[PDB]
Nucleic acid binder design. Structure first.
Ligand SMILES: [Mg+2]
Length: 95
DNA sequence: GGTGTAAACATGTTT
DNA sequence: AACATGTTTACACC
């Protein structure tokens, strides 16, 4: 079965996991399948949602590659702690 | 209101 | 001329 984490959670967990807090798009792919074996099936479906979420939400901001050798994906510092307890189940509220 | 899924579309890198 | 990477629009679900 599918894990209960949203794609926003999946992408956030990947970014927070990188030692430099920056991650390749495909680094996000490898992170998810390594952690959640559900996603080794029918990649074309869910990997498109990953791409789609990165551009939609203003919380995932794309930063250019420091230099060559795609581009890195970061978290906007406002949404670094969307999830409060590190359970990644629900997002805590504000405003 | 924020999700999930599908699709069209537009650049960029790799056979 | 196959791919990967982003951007955006559209609809059902909760
Ligand atoms: Mg974005």
């Amino acid at each position: 079965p599918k894990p209960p984490y949203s794609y926003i959670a999946l992408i956030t967990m990947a970014i927070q996991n990188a030692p430099e807090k920056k991650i390749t798009l495909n680094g996000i792919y490898q992170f998810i399948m390594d952690r959640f074996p559900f996603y080794r099936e029918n990649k074309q479906g869910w990997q498109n949602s990953i791409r789609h979420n990165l551009s939609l939400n203003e919380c995932f901001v794309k930063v250019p590659r420091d230099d060559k050798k795609g581009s890195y994906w970061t978290l906007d510092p406002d949404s670094y702690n969307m999830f409060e307890n590190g359970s990644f189940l629900r997002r805590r509220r504000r405003f």
